[PDB]
Amino acid sequence: MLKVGFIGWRGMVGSVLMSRMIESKDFDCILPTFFSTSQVGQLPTGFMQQYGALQDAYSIDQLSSMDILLSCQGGEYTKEIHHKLREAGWQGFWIDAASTLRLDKDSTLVLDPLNHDQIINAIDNGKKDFIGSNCTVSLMSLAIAGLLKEDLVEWVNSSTYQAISGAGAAAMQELLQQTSLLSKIDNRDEDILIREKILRELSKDSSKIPQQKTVQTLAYNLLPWIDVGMPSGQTKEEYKAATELNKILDTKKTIPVDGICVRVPSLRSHSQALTVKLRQKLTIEEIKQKISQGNEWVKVIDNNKEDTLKYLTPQANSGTLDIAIGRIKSSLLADDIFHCFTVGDQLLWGAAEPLRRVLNIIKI
Amino acid sequence: HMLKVGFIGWRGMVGSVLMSRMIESKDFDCILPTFFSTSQVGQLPTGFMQQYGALQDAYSIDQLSSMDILLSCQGGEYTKEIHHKLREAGWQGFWIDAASTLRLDKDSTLVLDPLNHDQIINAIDNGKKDFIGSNCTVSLMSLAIAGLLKEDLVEWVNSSTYQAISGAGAAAMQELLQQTSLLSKIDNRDEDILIREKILRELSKDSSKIPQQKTVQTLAYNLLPWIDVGMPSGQTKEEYKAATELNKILDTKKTIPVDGICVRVPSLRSHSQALTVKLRQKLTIEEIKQKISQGNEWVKVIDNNKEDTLKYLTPQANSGTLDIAIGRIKSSLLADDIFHCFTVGDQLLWGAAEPLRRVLNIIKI
Numbered sequence: 001m002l003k004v005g006f007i008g009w010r011g012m013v014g015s016v017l018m019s020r021m022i023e024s025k026d027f028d029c030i031l032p033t034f035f036s037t038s039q040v041g042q043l044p045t046g047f048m049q050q051y052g053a054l055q056d057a058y059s060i061d062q063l064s065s066m067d068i069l070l071s072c073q074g075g076e077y078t079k080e081i082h083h084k085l086r087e088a089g090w091q092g093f094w095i096d097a098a099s100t101l102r103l104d105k106d107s108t109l110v111l112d113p114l115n116h117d118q119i120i121n122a123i124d125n126g127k128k129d130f131i132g133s134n135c136t137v138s139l140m141s142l143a144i145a146g147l148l149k150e151d152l153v154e155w156v157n158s159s160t161y162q163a164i165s166g167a168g169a170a171a172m173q174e175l176l177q178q179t180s181l182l183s184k185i186d187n188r189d190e191d192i193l194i195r196e197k198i199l200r201e202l203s204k205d206s207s208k209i210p211q212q213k214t215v216q217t218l219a220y221n222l223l224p225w226i227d228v229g230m231p232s233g234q235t236k237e238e239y240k241a242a243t244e245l246n247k248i249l250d251t252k253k254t255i256p257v258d259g260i261c262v263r264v265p266s267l268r269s270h271s272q273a274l275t276v277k278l279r280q281k282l283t284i285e286e287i288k289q290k291i292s293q294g295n296e297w298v299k300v301i302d303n304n305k306e307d308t309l310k311y312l313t314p315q316a317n318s319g320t321l322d323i324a325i326g327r328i329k330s331s332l333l334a335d336d337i338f339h340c341f342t343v344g345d346q347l348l349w350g351a352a353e354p355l356r357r358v359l360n361i362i363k364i
Numbered sequence: 365h366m367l368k369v370g371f372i373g374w375r376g377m378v379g380s381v382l383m384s385r386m387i388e389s390k391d392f393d394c395i396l397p398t399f400f401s402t403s404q405v406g407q408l409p410t411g412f413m414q415q416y417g418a419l420q421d422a423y424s425i426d427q428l429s430s431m432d433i434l435l436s437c438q439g440g441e442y443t444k445e446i447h448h449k450l451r452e453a454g455w456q457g458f459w460i461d462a463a464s465t466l467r468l469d470k471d472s473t474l475v476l477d478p479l480n481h482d483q484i485i486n487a488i489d490n491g492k493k494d495f496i497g498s499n500c501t502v503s504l505m506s507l508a509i510a511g512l513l514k515e516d517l518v519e520w521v522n523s524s525t526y527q528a529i530s531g532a533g534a535a536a537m538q539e540l541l542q543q544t545s546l547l548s549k550i551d552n553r554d555e556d557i558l559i560r561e562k563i564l565r566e567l568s569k570d571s572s573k574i575p576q577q578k579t580v581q582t583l584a585y586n587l588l589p590w591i592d593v594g595m596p597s598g599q600t601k602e603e604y605k606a607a608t609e610l611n612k613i614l615d616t617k618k619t620i621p622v623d624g625i626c627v628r629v630p631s632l633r634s635h636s637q638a639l640t641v642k643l644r645q646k647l648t649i650e651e652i653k654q655k656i657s658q659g660n661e662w663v664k665v666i667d668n669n670k671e672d673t674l675k676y677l678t679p680q681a682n683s684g685t686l687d688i689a690i691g692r693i694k695s696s697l698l699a700d701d702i703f704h705c706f707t708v709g710d711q712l713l714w715g716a717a718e719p720l721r722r723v724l725n726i727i728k729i
C-alpha cells in the first residue's frame with residue numbers, strides 16, 4: 001500500500017486539497033502521513049488525526065520513507081529540500097505546486113485534461129517530478145482547451161484580473177483588513193468626492209492601513225505587477241505563461257502567450273480577458289462549439305448582460321470547479337481574432353485540483 | 365459684450381470636478397455665468413455660484429435661449445429632452461456636452477484638443493455649434509499613446525479595461541462604498557479564512573441584505589465584465605464606442621480598429637487599461653517610450669520596475685490628478701511589431717470634465 005506524505009496542508013491550497021480529497025475518497029487506498037514544522041510528534045486536530053502523529057517536514061529520513069510526497073509548501077521549501085532527497089538516494093514521486101521545478105527537463109507539468117497521455121508516458125519512462133503549472137496557464141488552457149486540442153490557436157493575449165489568494169492567506173487577511181479599516185473611517189454624511197479623497201489618503205498611510213503584504217493598499221485599487229522583474233520587461237508571472245503552455249501541450253510550433261498580470265481586490269477567482277488569434281478563420285458559432293467541447297468543466301456563458309453579470313464573475317465562480325467563459329465575440333482587429341473573458345477558481349483548478357488528479361494517476 | 369455661459373449638470377461629480385477646475389484656472393474671469401437647475405430654482409445656491417445670482421430653470425427654453433453657450437454634464441436623457449427643442453426654437457449657440465447622445469452626428473465634433481485642436485477650430489470656423497466629450501476610455505487611451513497616434517504609427521489597439529464606478533454616477537459609487545461597508549461589518553477576523561470568504565460571498569448575493577440594484581450585482585470583491593447596452597456584433601455599447609470615436613477624433617483616412625473588453629472593477633475614479641498595440645512599423649522599445657513620452661504634457665511614464673509600478677501606476681496614485689500614467693511598456697512575444705503597456709487616468713477629469721473646460725476656452729477665445 002502506497003505511503004504518501006503531505007507537506008503544505010495547513011494553508012489555503014492545502015486545505016482545498018484536503019477538502020477535495022475527503023469529498024473524492026482519495027485517502028481510501030493510501031497510507032497518508034502528514035508533515036509539519038510546528039506541533040511535530042503531536043496528534044493534529046481534524047481527520048488527519050486518524051493517520052497518527054505529525055512528522056517533521058525538514059527531517060530527510062522521515063520524508064525518504066514515503067513512496068510519494070505532495071507539497072503545497074512553496075518554492076523556498078522545495079529549493080531547500082527536494083535536492084537533498086535526490087542527493088540522498090530517494091527515487092519516489094514528488095508532486096509539487098511551487099514553480100521551482102516547472103521547467104527542468106526531468107519535470108512534467110500536470111494538467112491532465114490536456115496532457116494525461118503525457119503524464120502516463122512520463123511515469124512510464126521513470127520520470128518522478130510532477131509539477132502544477134501557474135494558475136493563469138491552468139485556467140486559461142482549460143477555458144480554450146477545445147481550440148488548443150485542435151491546434152487552432154496561433155497566439156493569446158491575456159490581461160488578468162487576479163485575486164489575492166494566489167499570494168497566500170496573510171495577503172488575503174490583509175486585503176480584508178484594509179477594506180475593514182477604510183470602511184470604518186468612511187462617513188456616509190460627508191460629500192462623495194471628499195469621502196473618496198479621505199479613503200485615498202488613508203490608503204497610503206502604512207502606519208494606519210497595513211500594506212506590507214500587498215506592498216500597497218489593494219482595496220479600491222489595482223496592482224499591475226505580480227512577482228519578480230524579468231530582463232525582457234515582463235514580470236516572472238507573465239513570462240511563465242508562454243513557456244508553460246508550450247511545455248504542457250508539448251508543441252512542435254511555439255504558441256506565443258503574452259499580456260499583463262494585474263492584482264485586483266478579488267478573493268479566490270482569477271479572471272482573464274483573452275484575445276486569441278486563430279490559425280484559420282472560424283465563425284463565432286464554430287468557436288463557441290469547439291470551446292464548449294474542451295472538457296467537462298468549461299462552462300459557456302451566453303453573450304448577454306443578464307447572464308454575464310450573473311454567471312461570468314468571481315462571485316459566481318468562487319468555490320466551484322467551473323471554468324466560466326463568456327463574452328465570446330469576433331474582433332475588429334482581424335478576421336481571425338476573437339475575444340472572450342473567463343473566470344475560474346485559483347485554489348482549485350488554479351492550484352489544488354491538478355495535483356490531486358495526478359496523484360490518482362500515479363497511485364493507480 | 366461678454367459671453368453668457370450657462371451651466372447644466374454642475375451638482376454631480378463631473379460637474380463638481382469641472383467647477384473646481386474652472387475656479388483653479390480662473391475660467392470664470394471673462395464670461396457671465398448662469399447656473400441652471402431642476403430643483404431650487406430662484407434660490408441662491410451656496411458656494412461661489414452665489415456671486416452669479418439665482419438658479420434658473422434647466423427646462424425653461426426661454427432662459428436657456430439667451431445663453432451664448434451652454435455646457436451640460438446633465439446626461440443623455442436631458443440632452444434628449446432639450447437640445448432639439450432649442451434648435452427647433454431657433455437658438456444658434458454652442459452646445460458643449462458630456463453625454464454621448466450627439467457624439468456621432470455629422471454636425472457634432474468630438475473634443476480632445478491635445479489631439480484634434482486644429483479640427484475644433486475648423487469646426488467653429490465653419491459655423492458648427494455642437495462639441496461633445498468622448499467616452500472616458502477613448503479619452504484616456506488616446507492621450508496615453510498620443511505620441512504614437514500623431515505619427516500615425518498605430519495599426520490597431522486591444523484594450524482590456526479595469527473601470528471605476530464613478531463613470532456610472534454618484535449613487536453607484538455610494539452603493540459600492542456601502543456594499544463594502546456592510547460586508548466589512550459581517551466579516552469576522554477570528555473565523556477561518558476560507559470560511560470568511562464563503563460568508564462574504566454568500567452575503568454579497570442577497571439583494572435584500574446588500575443593495576445591488578445600481579450595480580445590478582455586488583461589485584465589492586467582484587468584477588463585472590459588462591458595461592452598457594448589448595450590441596448585435598457581440599460588443600457592449602461601451603466597447604463599440606472605442607473604435608468609432610477614436611477614428612472620429614483623429615478623422616482617419618484609414619480606420620484604426622479598437623477592440624477588447626470593458627470591465628467594471630471596485631475602483632472609485634480612475635480607469636485603468638492594459639493595452640496591446642500593433643504598430644505600422646517595427647520600433648525598438650526605447651523609440652516607443654520616447655514617442656509616448658512626447659505625446660503631451662500629461663503623459664507620465666512610469667519606469668518598468670516593481671517599486672515604481674506599484675507606487676505610481678495605480679488608481680490610488682492617480683486619482684484626483686491630471687496625470688495620464690503609463691507603464692509596463694514592453695515588447696511582445698506575439699509579434700515583432702506589437703508592444704504592451706498599462707495606463708491609468710482619472711475618469712472625472714481627463715475622462716469627463718477636462719476636455720469640456722478646454723473646448724469652452726477655445727470657443728470663448
Ligand code: NA
Nearest residue numbers: 664665666667
Ligand atoms: Na517617468
